[PDB]
Design a protein around this ligand. Structure first.
Ligand SMILES: COC1=C(OC)C(=O)C(C/C=C(\C)CC/C=C(\C)CC/C=C(\C)CC/C=C(\C)CC/C=C(\C)CC/C=C(\C)CC/C=C(\C)CCC=C(C)C)=C(C)C1=O
Length: 216
């Protein structure tokens, strides 16, 4: 890793950028799972009238993320990371209920393409000495917000029992109302990914002395 003074944001931004692809490829012997393609645990939500499930979920694109800024605040003991990427979410979905003003049913495969999604991550940490006297950054909590800035496209198979007219109408509807759909339903999907990524970064930093990857 590129070593930085922690409050040198330009350095930290580059250091996160240069490490990211290698980190998200996974470090299996160290217990760090692959994060591109990231396997999502099975999840479901019931929000705004939509009942949705995703199994075998996959998130592609983190390897290609662009780090916009890293601000490590030693006083507050928080780290703010702003980044963006194109991503895809795939998996076996089910849908029921309604999407906004249209009824929906489906059970099939999904390919959701997200263009220029911006993510704002805040993490709280503590610097802790382990039983052997070695200092580590220990991540505690996080928050994430998102904004899909360019567009999102929805590919869903076997909507409406295979009915092409209804399926075409729904896919058109989703793509037309992509921003609203992202604001209604993005949070649970983001969380399925973020909880896994956070656990992996936390684990990695708990086992790598802070002195090995940063300057005091
Ligand atoms: C010493 O300094 C340090 C380093 O060196 C400087 C390091 O390298 C490192 C490690 C290396 C880096 C820190 C790597 C860190 C990696 C980071 C921060 C990446 C973080 C990843 C995020 C937390 C999560 C990312 C999540 C995503 C991209 C998923 C986003 C998806 C979203 C928002 C979904 C949007 C949804 C929609 C549009 C619609 C959803 C619709 C539906 C679900 C329904 C579909 C429609 C119906 C009808 C079926 C550390 C830790 C360090 O401290």
């Amino acid at each position: 890793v590129e070593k930085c003074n922690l409050e040198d944001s330009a350095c930290m931004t580059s250091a996160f950028q240069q490490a990211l692809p290698t980190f998200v490829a996974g470090l299996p012997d160290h217990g760090v799972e692959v994060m591109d393609v990231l396997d999502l645990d099975d999840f479901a939500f019931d929000l705004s009238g939509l009942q949705f499930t995703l199994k075998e979920g996959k998130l592609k694109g983190l390897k290609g993320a662009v780090i916009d800024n890293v601000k490590w605040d030693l006083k507050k003991k928080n780290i703010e990371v702003d980044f963006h990427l194109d991503a895809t979410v795939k998996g076996h979905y089910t849908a029921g209920g309604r999407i906004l003003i249209l009824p929906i049913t489906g059970d099939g495969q999904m390919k959701l393409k997200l263009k220029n999604i911006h993510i704002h991550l805040v993490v709280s940490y503590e610097m802790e000495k382990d039983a052997e006297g070695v200092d580590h950054v220990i991540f505690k909590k996080y928050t994430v917000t998102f904004d899909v800035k360019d567009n999102a496209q929805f590919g869903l198979t076997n909507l409406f029992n295979g009915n092409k007219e209804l399926s075409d109408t729904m896919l058109t509807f989703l793509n037309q109302n992509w921003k609203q759909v992202s604001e209604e339903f993005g949070k649970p999907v983001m969380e399925a990914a973020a909880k896994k990524i956070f656990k992996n970064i936390k684990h990695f930093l708990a086992k790598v002395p802070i002195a090995e990857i940063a300057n005091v």
